[PDB]
Amino acid sequence: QLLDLAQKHLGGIPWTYAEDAVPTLTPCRFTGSEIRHRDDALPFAHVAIAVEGPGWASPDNVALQVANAIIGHYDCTYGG
């Protein structure tokens, strides 16, 4: 039913692309830099640190997920 319905309401969407100039995604570079916006009037310090990670379609990510779970999140309310 869904497929038959989508035909009537989404068949008109254009599909022919100009000169087949599909916007292929260019790669992106990662740089080890730091930005420090200092404002001493704010309540708490607030930092974030990161490193280059695999793409969305690599097996390794699964293992990284496990490693993340080992580190674990935390909060002050947790009654542990």
Binding site: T31, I35, R38, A41
Partner: protein, 81 residues
């Protein structure tokens, strides 16, 4: 006052830096480095050099006068006869 945690109170400032491994250790050391050194030297040349030149002049004259004194006196022997 002696711990990085509490030294001063600053606000509304941002900073940007790059990793040591992402940049050259000698960037523009041929087109932008030398001229800056020349600026440094020129900007403080007349404030130092000339005084030490006076020292050199005082040093040379001194030595010259010292040796000039040890020369024999022809006016102390003209009449000695």
């Amino acid at each position: 006052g002696r711990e990085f945690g509490n030294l001063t109170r600053m606000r509304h400032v941002i900073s940007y830096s790059l990793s040591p491994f992402e940049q050259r250790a000698y960037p523009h050391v041929f087109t932008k480095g030398i001229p800056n050194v020349l600026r440094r030297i020129r900007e403080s040349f007349f404030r130092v050099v000339p005084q030490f030149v006076v020292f050199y002049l005082i040093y040379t004259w001194g030595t010259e006068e010292f040796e000039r004194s040890k020369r024999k006196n022809p006016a102390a022997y003209e009449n000695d006869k």
